[PDB]
Structure 1
């Protein structure tokens, strides 16, 4: 019931930095994690490449090179190998390209890999942020709705070694429903990655609130569902776009218990007691005692 959770924040991944170069950066973090008694580490969203949805692509082949067609392929394999021989689980985000009867499905995906190196769960991003068309005035695009489709796995919770773990991806953390669906399935840890620019072209009047909104989302989510949470950023200046840092780990009371302070590759860690979830879920947010779903119907109407 007690474990050490970590977050492996990434600094920038350049457009032509290789997957072999990224994996090497991930392995060094696993190594750092293992010297600090870590048992599970969270890596960022789209952790194997630069954040490619910042450009408008005119070439499908070029677009497809940023997606994984297997997991892991030969180059990502050492990550898996290293993490199991260290006996450390991990959450990895990546772009997923699958071919169904000749039709190409694209997803922004994350997976949970237990301490033995078994993939025990997958999640695909349901809330895809940004815009649809190329928008000339932006200094950088945000075309996730063009490069991915909404996930089709719902928000699942999985058994990973001792814990019940749910996943979120980036913008999903901002929606109370993401958290609540996994809270209703008894997640003890909700975790995921993000790439969050500190400039937003259509509403630049919120730019100086980027960290505030990120942390607000993580603290409320955890508190409302009594779940430990963790958010691992890919951060700093990547291809000219400044990505938010403040990767974090948060208690079931919404307290931030660990926080990064660099914009580089950085491992933060926190001791997690999975029975601490009880302080909320057996008390103020004891859902059978207090929740009232018969009056929340509008939320699930579509």
Structure 2
């Protein structure tokens, strides 16, 4: 007994044609709905290739306004038809600012708003800093028809501060659409296990379930210095509130993952365990420094 919610993580390969990719997302959202899902999660920047392997002027113009975005609009229809909640990842132009953003569509089709990615990565393969202003929404939670949820994006998932921020604001489930794989400058880097552990940690430290949707496939992008290739490693997963993996995909298969949580029992478990009662914000001022002594402006 108690409010139960079924969540789903999707895992698929992308071409660089928007309509192909949106057709793919739709097919899988429906497949998840067919299995009982209430909230379905689509991987980061799914409208195309993960173009950030390059640092190209013409690629910055892939961005589009949040207002009347044709991909958000199309998925609001799906949300409404199906009765599911669908976070929609997109590359946002906002006058001369640009952001890696996500709009949260409620189960009645209502656009509840956006979150703009806060932590922006950088390095060979993942030159995001060239493309995105660091996010200025701050961490947010959204009241949906089924639950209060915290949605952040890809690299944000490495930061315990983001997960905690969402949980302090009542997030009952955390969601992280992701694009991660090999790194083109060094074939010995394999980050998949490290990536999962860090996320399981957030789930267990906040006692909320957590959903992560990652890309698969090889993608080859022309950069300023020639071809660059990433193999994306999937491993989409759902973790429960002690950080146990309840569902996980491999590194190559298209996948639809499903899991049910009793949000009232978990709330009760979260409070009982005591961590939120026991936090010491009085001693946490150092977290507002970068360097361990100087608080930022």
Task: Provide the C-alpha distance between the structure 2 equivalents of 1:82 and 1:261, rounded to a whole number of angstroms.
Answer: 27
- TM (normalized to structure 1)? 0.86
The CA deviation at 1:31 is 1.8
Deviates more, 1:292-301 or 1:252-261: 292-301
Alignment-derived partner of residue 41 in structure 1: 40
Deviations 1:112-156 (A, max 9, x none): 11111111131111110114xxxxxxxx53211110011101101
Task: Spell out the pairing of 1:81-96 with structure 2 (5 A cutoff).
Answer: 81-96=77-92
Distance verdict in 2 for CA 1:274–1:113, change over 3 Å:
same
Structure 1, gaps ≥5 residues long: 132-139
Does 2:12 align with 1:10?
yes
TM-score, normalised via structure 2 length: 0.88
Q: Does 1:278 align with 2:272?
A: no
Q: CA RMSD in A?
A: 1.9
Of 166, 175, 191, the residue aligned with 2:150 is 166
Match of residue 50 from structure 2: 51
Give the SS at the match of 2:272.
coil
Deviation sequence 1:213-260 (CA, Å, 0-9, x none): 111022100111111110111222122311121001111110111111
Aligned pair 1:144/2:140, yes or no? no
Which residue does 2:225 correspond to in 1? none
CA contact (8 A) 2:125 2:183 kept: no
Return the alpha-carbon distance in structure 1 between the equivalents of residues 22 and 239 of structure 2: 26
Q: Aligned in 2, Cα 1:258/1:198: closer, same or farther, shift over 3 Å? A: same
Residues 184, 230 of structure 2: 8 Å contact kept: no
Residues in 2 aligned to 1:41 and 1:157: alpha-carbon distance in whole angstroms? 16
Is 1:178 the counterpart of 2:166 in the alignment?
no
The offset of 1:105, in angstroms, is 0.9
Contact 1:45/1:93 (<8 A) preserved:
yes
Instruction: Measure the CA separation in 1 of the matches of 2:68 and 2:247.
Output: 30
